[PDB]
CSV table of C-alpha atoms and ligand atoms in Angstrom, one decimal:
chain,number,residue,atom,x,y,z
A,180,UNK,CA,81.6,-0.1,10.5
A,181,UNK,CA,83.5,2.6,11.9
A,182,UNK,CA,84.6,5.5,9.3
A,183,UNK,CA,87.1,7.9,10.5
A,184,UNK,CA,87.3,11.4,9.2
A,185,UNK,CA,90.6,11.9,7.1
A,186,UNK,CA,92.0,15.5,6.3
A,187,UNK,CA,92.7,15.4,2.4
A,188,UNK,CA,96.1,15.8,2.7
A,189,UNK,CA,98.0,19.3,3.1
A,190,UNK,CA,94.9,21.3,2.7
A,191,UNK,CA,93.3,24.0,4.9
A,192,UNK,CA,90.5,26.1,5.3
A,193,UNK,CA,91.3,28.5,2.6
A,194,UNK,CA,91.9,25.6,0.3
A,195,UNK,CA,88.1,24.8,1.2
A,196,UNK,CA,86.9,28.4,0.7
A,197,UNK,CA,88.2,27.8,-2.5
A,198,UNK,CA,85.9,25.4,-3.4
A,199,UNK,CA,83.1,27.0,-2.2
A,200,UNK,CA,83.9,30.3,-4.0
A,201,UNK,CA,83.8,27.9,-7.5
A,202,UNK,CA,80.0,26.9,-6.5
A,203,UNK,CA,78.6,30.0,-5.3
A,204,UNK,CA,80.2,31.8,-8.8
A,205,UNK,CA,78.9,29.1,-10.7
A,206,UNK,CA,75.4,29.1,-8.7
A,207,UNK,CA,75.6,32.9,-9.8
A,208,UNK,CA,76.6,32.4,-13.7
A,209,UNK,CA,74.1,29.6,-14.4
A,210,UNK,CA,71.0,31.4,-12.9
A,211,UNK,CA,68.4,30.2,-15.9
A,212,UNK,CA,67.8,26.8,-14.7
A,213,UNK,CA,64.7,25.4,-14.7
A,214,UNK,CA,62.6,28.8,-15.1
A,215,UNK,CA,64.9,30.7,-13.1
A,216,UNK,CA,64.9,29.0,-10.0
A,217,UNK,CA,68.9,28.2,-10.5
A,218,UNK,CA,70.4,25.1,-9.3
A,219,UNK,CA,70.8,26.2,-5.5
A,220,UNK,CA,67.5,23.7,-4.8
A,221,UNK,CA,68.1,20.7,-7.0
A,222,UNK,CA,72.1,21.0,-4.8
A,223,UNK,CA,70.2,21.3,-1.3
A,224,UNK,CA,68.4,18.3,-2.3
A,225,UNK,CA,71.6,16.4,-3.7
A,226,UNK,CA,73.5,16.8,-0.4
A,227,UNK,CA,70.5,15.5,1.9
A,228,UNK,CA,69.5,12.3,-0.6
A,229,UNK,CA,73.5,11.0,-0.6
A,230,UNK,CA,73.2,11.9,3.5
A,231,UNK,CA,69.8,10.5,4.0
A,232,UNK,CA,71.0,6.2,3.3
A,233,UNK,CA,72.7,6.2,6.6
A,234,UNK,CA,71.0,3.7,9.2
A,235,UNK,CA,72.6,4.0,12.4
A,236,UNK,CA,72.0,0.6,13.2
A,237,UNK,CA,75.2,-0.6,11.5
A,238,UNK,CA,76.6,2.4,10.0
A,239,UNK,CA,76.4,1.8,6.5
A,240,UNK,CA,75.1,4.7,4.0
A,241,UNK,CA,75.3,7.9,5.1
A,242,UNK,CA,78.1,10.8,3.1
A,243,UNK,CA,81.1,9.7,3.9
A,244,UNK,CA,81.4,7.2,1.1
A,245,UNK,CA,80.4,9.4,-1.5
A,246,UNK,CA,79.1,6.3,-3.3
A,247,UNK,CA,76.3,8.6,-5.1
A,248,UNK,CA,79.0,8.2,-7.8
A,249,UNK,CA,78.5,4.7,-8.5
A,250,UNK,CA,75.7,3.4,-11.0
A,251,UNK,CA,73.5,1.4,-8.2
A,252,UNK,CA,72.8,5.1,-6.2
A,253,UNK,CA,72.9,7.3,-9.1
A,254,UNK,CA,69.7,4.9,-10.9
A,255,UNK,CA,68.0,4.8,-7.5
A,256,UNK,CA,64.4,5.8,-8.6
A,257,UNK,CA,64.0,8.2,-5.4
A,258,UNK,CA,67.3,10.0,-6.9
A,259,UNK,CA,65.5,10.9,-10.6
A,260,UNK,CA,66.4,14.5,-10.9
A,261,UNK,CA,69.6,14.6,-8.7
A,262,UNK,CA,71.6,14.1,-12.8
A,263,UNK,CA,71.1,17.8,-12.8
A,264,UNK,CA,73.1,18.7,-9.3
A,265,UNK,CA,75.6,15.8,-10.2
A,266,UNK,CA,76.7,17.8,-13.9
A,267,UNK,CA,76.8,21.1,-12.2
A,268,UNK,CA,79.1,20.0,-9.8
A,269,UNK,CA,81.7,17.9,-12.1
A,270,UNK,CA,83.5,21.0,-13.7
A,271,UNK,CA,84.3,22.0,-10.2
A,272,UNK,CA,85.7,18.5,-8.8
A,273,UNK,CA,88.2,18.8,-12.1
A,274,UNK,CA,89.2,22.1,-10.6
A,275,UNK,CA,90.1,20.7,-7.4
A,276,UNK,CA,90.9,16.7,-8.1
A,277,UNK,CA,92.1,16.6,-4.1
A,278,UNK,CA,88.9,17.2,-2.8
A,279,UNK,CA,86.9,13.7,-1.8
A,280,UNK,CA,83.0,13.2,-3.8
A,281,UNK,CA,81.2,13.0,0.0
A,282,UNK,CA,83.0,16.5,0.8
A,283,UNK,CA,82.3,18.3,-2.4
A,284,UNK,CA,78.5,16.8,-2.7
A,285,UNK,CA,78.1,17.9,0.9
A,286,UNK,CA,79.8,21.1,0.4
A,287,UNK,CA,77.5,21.7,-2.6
A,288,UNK,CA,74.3,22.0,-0.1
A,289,UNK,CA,76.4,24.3,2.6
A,290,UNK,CA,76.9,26.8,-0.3
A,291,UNK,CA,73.8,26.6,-1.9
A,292,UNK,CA,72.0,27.2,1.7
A,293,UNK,CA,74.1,30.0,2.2
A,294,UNK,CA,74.1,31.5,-1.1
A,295,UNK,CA,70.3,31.8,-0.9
A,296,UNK,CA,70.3,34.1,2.2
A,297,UNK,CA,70.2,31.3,4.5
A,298,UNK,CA,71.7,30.7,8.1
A,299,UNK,CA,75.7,29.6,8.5
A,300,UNK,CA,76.0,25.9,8.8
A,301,UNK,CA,79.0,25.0,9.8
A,302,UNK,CA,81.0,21.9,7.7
A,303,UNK,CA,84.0,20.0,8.7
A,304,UNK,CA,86.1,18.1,6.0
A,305,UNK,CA,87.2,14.3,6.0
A,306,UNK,CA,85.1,12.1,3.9
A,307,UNK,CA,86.8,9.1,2.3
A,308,UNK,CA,85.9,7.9,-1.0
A,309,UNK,CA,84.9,4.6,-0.4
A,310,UNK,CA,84.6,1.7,-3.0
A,311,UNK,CA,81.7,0.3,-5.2
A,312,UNK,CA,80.4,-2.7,-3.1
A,313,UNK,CA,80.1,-0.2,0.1
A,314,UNK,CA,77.0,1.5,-1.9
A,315,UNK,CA,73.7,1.1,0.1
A,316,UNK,CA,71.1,-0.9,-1.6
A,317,UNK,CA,68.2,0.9,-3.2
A,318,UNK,CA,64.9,1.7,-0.7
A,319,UNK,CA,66.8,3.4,2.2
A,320,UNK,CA,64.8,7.0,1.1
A,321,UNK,CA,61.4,8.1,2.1
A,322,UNK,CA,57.9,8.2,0.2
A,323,UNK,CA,55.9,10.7,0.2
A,324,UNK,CA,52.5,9.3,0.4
A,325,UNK,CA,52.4,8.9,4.0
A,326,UNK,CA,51.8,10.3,7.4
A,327,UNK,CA,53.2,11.8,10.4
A,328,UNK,CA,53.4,8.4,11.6
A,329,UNK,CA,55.9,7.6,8.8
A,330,UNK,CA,58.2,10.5,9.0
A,331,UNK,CA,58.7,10.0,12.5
A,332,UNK,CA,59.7,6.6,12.4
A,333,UNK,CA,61.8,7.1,8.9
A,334,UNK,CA,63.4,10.0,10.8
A,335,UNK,CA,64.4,7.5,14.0
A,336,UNK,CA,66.8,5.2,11.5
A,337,UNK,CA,68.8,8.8,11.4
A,338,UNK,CA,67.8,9.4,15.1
A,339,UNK,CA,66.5,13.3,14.6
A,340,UNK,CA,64.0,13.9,16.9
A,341,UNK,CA,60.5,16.2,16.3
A,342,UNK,CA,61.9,19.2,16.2
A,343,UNK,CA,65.1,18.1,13.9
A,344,UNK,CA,62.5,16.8,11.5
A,345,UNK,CA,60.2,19.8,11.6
A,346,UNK,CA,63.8,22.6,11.2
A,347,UNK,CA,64.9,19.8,8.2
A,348,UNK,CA,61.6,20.0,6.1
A,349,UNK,CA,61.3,23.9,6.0
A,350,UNK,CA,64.2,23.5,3.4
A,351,UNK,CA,60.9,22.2,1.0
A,352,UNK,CA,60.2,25.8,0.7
A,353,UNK,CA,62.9,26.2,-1.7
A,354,UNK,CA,62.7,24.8,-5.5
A,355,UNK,CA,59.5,22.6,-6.7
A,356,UNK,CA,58.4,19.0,-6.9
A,357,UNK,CA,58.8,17.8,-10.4
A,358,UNK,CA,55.8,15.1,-12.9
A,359,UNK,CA,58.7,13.2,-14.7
A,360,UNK,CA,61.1,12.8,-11.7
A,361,UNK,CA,58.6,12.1,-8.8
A,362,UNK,CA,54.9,12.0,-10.2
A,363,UNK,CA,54.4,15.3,-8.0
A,364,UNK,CA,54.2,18.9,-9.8
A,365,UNK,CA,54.2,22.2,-8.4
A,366,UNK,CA,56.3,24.8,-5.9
A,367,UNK,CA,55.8,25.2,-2.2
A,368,UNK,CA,55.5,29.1,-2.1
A,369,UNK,CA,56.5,32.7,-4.2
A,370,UNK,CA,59.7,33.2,-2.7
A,371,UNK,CA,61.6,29.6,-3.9
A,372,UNK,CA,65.3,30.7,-3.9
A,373,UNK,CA,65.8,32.0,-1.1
A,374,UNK,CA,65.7,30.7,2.5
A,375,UNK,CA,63.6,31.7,4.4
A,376,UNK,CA,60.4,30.3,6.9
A,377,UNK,CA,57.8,30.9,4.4
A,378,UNK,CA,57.2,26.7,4.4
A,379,UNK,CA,55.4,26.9,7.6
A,380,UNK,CA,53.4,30.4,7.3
A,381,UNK,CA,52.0,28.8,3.7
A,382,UNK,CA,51.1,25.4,5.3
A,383,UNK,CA,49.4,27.6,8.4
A,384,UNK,CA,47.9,30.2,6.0
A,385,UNK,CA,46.3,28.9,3.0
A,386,UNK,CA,43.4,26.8,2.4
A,387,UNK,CA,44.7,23.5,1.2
A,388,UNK,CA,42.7,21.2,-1.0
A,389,UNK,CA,43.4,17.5,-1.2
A,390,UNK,CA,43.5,17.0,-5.0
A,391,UNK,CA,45.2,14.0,-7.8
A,392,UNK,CA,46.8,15.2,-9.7
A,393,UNK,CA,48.3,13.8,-13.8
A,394,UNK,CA,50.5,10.9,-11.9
A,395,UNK,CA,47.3,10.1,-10.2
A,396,UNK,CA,49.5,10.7,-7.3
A,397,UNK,CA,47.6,13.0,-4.4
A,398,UNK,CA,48.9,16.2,-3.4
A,399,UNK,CA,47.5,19.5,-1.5
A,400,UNK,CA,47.0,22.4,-3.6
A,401,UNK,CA,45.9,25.8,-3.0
A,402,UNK,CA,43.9,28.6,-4.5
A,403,UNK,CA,47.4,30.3,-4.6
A,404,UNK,CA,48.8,28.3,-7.1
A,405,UNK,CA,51.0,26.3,-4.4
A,406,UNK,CA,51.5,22.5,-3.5
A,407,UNK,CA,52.2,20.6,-0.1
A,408,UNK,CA,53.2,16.7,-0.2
A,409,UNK,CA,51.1,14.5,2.1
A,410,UNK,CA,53.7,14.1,4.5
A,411,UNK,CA,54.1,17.7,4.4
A,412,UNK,CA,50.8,18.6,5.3
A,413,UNK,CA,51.3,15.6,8.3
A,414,UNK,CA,53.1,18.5,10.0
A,415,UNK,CA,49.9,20.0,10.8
A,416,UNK,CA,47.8,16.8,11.7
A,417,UNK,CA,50.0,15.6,14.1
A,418,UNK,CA,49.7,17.8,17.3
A,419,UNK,CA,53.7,17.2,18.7
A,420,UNK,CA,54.7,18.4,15.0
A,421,UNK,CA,52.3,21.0,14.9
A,422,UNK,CA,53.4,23.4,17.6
A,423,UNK,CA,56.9,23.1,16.2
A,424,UNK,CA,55.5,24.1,12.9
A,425,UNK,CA,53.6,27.5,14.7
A,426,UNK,CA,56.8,28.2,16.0
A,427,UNK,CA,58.9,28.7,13.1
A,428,UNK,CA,56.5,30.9,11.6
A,429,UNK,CA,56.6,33.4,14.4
A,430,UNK,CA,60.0,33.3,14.4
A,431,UNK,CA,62.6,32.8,11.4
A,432,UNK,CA,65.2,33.1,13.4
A,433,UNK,CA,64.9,30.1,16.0
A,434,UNK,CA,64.0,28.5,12.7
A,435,UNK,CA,67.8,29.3,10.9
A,436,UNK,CA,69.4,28.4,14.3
A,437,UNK,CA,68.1,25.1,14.2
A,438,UNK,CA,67.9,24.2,10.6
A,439,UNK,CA,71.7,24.9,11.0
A,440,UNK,CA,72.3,22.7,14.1
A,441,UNK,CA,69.9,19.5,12.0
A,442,UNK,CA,71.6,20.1,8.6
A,443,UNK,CA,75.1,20.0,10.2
A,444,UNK,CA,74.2,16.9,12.2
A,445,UNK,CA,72.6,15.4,8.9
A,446,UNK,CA,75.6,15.9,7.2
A,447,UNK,CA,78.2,14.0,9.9
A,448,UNK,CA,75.9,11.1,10.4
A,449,UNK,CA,78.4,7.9,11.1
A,450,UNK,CA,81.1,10.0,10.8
A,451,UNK,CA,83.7,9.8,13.5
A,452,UNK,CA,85.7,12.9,14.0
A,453,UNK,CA,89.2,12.7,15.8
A,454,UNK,CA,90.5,15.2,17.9
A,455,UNK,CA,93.2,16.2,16.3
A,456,UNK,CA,90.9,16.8,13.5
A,457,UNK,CA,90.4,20.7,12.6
A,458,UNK,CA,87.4,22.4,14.4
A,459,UNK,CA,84.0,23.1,11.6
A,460,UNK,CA,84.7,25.8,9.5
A,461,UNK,CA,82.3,28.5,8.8
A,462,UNK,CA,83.3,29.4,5.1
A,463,UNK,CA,82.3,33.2,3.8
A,464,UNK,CA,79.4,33.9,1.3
A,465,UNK,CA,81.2,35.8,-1.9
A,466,UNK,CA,79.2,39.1,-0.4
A,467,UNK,CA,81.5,39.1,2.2
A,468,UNK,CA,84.4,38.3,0.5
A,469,UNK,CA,83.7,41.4,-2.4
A,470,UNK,CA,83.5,39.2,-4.9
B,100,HEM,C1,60.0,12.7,4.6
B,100,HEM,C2,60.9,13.6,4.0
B,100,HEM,C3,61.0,14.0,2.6
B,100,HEM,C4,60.3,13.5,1.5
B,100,HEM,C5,59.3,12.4,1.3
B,100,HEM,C6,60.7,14.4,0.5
B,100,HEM,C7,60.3,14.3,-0.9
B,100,HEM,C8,60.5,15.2,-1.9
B,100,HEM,C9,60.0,15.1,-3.2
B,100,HEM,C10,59.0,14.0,-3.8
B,100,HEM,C11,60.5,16.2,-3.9
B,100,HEM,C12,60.3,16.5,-5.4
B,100,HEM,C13,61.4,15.9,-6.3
B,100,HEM,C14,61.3,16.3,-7.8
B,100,HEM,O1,60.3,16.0,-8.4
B,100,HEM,O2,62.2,16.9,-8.4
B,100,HEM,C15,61.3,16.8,-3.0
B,100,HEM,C16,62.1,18.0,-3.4
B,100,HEM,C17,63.0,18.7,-2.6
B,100,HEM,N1,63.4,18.2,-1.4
B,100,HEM,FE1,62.5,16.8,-0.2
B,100,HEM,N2,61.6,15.3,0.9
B,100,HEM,C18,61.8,15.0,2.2
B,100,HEM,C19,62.8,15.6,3.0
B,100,HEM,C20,63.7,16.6,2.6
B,100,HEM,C21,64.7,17.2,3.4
B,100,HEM,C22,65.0,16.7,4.8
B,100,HEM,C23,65.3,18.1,2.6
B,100,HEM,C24,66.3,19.0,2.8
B,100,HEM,C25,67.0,19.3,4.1
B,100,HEM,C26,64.6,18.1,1.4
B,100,HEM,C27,64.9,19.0,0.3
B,100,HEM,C28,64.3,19.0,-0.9
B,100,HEM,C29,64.5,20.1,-1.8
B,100,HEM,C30,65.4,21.3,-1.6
B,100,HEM,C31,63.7,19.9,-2.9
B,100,HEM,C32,63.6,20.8,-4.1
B,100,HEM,C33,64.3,20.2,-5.3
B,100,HEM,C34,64.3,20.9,-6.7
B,100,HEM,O3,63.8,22.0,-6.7
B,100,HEM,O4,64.7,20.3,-7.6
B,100,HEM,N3,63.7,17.2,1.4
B,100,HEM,N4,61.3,16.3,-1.8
C-alpha cells in the first residue's frame, strides 16, 4: 500500500480552525463526564487506538483509513470505551460533512491535547476514507500485562524509538483506567485534565504496591489513592527507559517538545505527503482566539 494525502477539496486552514473551534466548545459545554474529568481523555485515547493498527511492514492500519467507523474496529475488545469519544464527535462531523473520519478522529486528540494546557502539535489534513474490507483485523493493539520488553518491541511495528515511547506514555497521566472496559480501575495522578509531566514525578515519587485488583487483573497502587499499569511501571525497571523517565520530570518542557514531535509523527504513520500539499498547521486554542 501506498496512501497519498488528499486535500478535502476547496478547503483551508480556517475551514479547519473551524472544526477545531466546534470540539474545543463542545469539550467546554459537556464538562460533567465521567465525574468531571470531561471527554478531553477518552478523545486523546480515541485518536492514538485508530493510529496505533498501523504496521509499517505493509502499510495497512494506521488513520488514514478512518476505518474505526466500521463494525469489525469499533467491537475490537481493546477499543471498549472509545463508544463514548465516537458519540461526542458525531454532532460535529454533521456540522462539517466535507471533513474525512481519519482527519476529524485525529483532529479530535490535537484539540483535546491542546485544550487541556498542553503543547502545540502540529496536524496536517489529507486522510481518505477508505472502504470496509481495508479495516485491520482485531489484535494489532497492546496489552497491558507485560514488560519493558513488550513495549519496546510493540513500539518497533510503529518504529518509535525509547524516547518516542517514553514522551507517548506521559499522555496516561490524563483521564483513568476503567473495571468494565479494560478490567483495570483507578487514575494515574490529582491533576487528570490537564497536561502536564506529573506521569513521571508520580511513578518516581510514590511508593507503589503490586496489588489484584476485582478483574483479578494486577495493577500498582499507591497509598495516594493512584494506579500504574504493569507496563507503566516497566518504565522504571528498564534502565534505557528509566533515565528518559527522570528526565521529563525535571523538566516539562523537553517533555511537551517531544510529546509534540511523537504524537505528530503517531498521527502521519503510512501517510505519504506530497509536496504540493499545504505545510502542518498549528490551529489556535479558543483562549487565543477570545472566544
Ligand atoms: C503500551 C501502551 C499502552 C497500553 C497497554 C495502554 C493501555 C491503556 C489502558 C488499559 C487504559 C484504560 C482504558 C479504560 O479502561 O478505559 C488506557 C487509558 C488511556 N490511554 Fe493508554 N495505553 C498505552 C499507550 C497509550 C498511548 C501511547 C496514549 C496516548 C498517546 C495513551 C492514552 C490513553 C489515555 C489518554 C487514556 C485515558 C482514557 C480515559 O480516561 O478514558 N495510551 N490505556
Amino acid at each position: 500500500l501506498v496512501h497519498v494525502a488528499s486535500v478535502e477539496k476547496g478547503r483551508s486552514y480556517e475551514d479547519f480552525q473551524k472544526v477545531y473551534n466546534a470540539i474545543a466548545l463542545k469539550l467546554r459545554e459537556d464538562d460533567e463526564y465521567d465525574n468531571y474529568i470531561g471527554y478531553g481523555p477518552v478523545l486523546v485515547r480515541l485518536a492514538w487506538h485508530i493510529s496505533g493498527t498501523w504496521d509499517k511492514h505493509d502499510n495497512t492500519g494506521g488513520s488514514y483509513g478512518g476505518t474505526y467507523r466500521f463494525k469489525k474496529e469499533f467491537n475490537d475488545p481493546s477499543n471498549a470505551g472509545l463508544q463514548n469519544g465516537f458519540k461526542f464527535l458525531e454532532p460535529i462531523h454533521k456540522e462539517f460533512p466535507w471533513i474525512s473520519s481519519g482527519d476529524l478522529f485525529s483532529l479530535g486528540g490535537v484539540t483535546a491535547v491542546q485544550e487541556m494546557q498542553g503543547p502545540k502539535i502540529p496536524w496536517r489534513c489529507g486522510r481518505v476514507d477508505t472502504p470496509e474490507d481495508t479495516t485491520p483485523d482485531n489484535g494489532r493493539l497492546p496489552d497491558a500485562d507485560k514488560d519493558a520488553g513488550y513495549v519496546r518491541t510493540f513500539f518497533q511495528r510503529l518504529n518509535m524509538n525509547d524516547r518516542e515511547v517514553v514522551a507517548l506514555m506521559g499522555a496516561h497521566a490524563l483521564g483513568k483506567t476503567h473495571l468494565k472496559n479494560s478490567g483495570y480501575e483507578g487514575p494515574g495522578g490529582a491533576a487528570n485534565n490537564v497536561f502536564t509531566n506529573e506521569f513521571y514525578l508520580n511513578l518516581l515519587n510514590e511508593d507503589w504496591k503490586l496489588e489484584k485488583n476485582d478483574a483479578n487483573n494486577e495493577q500498582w497502587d499507591s497509598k495516594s489513592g493512584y494506579m500504574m499499569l504493569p507496563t507503566d511501571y516497566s518504565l522504571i525497571q528498564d534502565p534505557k527507559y528509566l533515565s528518559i523517565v527522570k528526565e521529563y520530570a525535571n523538566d516539562q518542557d523537553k517533555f511537551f517538545k517531544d510529546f509534540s514531535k511523537a504524537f505528530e509523527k503517531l498521527l502521519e504513520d503510512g501517510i505519504t505527503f506530497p509536496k504540493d500539499a499545504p505545510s502542518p498547521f498549528i490551529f489556535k486554542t479558543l483562549e487565543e482566539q477570545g472566544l
